[PDB]
């Protein structure tokens, strides 16, 4: 048994970007699938980068390159900004 999901986290983000709306179950399923999809796509690209460069580990730099290589333009720069923000905040704690 024992099936996991991202529904709790998607709901937590939603009720801070639009703290009045809800979300249907089908929509929550769609958003969960979307998150898993993007996670798979970025992780695959990062692993392939590691394989190309003979490195044996996935690191924040490889995640950053994979993001710049998957997302289009404006999304790329915004996402990179927030990724670096979170990383520095975390490591200074």
């Amino acid at each position: 048994t024992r099936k996991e999901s991202y529904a709790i986290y998607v709901y937590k983000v939603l009720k801070q970007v639009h703290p009045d709306t809800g979300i249907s179950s089908k929509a929550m399923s769609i958003m969960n699938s979307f998150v898993n999809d993007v996670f798979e796509r970025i992780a695959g690209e990062a692993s392939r980068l590691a394989h190309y460069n003979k490195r044996s580990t996935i690191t924040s730099r490889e995640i950053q390159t994979a993001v710049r290589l998957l997302l289009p333009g404006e999304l790329a720069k915004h996402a990179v900004s927030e990724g670096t923000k979170a990383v520095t905040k975390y490591t200074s704690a």
Partner: protein, 107 residues
């Protein structure tokens, strides 16, 4: 000995422990950096917020509260960057963006 989750330590809402576990147990590389989960969680949270805001705006436009696959579809298609990202993705029970070719209209 206070149990401070990395997810809170980084200031995110998405889980960083779960992302790290998926990276380790997902057959991506032998070793996984320390900040890699934090970065990837940040990116996922950003993308989720970006899509979810447009979906909520569309839901308000249709004067409804709870967002639905139709609203997600509208957000993705009306936006251009998300539409380029999800170029080959079909969204179940979504719809089609309303569009009628000009020639077909009456004179």
């Amino acid at each position: 000995a206070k149990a401070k989750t990395r997810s809170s330590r980084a200031g995110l809402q998405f889980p960083v422990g779960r992302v790290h576990r998926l990276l380790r147990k997902g057959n991506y590389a032998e070793r996984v950096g320390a900040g890699a989960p934090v970065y990837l969680a940040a990116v996922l949270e950003y993308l989720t917020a970006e899509i979810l805001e447009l979906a909520g705006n569309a839901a308000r436009d249709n004067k409804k509260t709870r967002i639905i696959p139709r609203h997600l579809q509208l957000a993705v298609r009306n936006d251009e960057e998300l539409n380029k990202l999800l170029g080959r993705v079909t969204i179940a029970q979504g719809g089609v963006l309303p569009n009628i070719q000009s020639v077909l209209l009456p004179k």
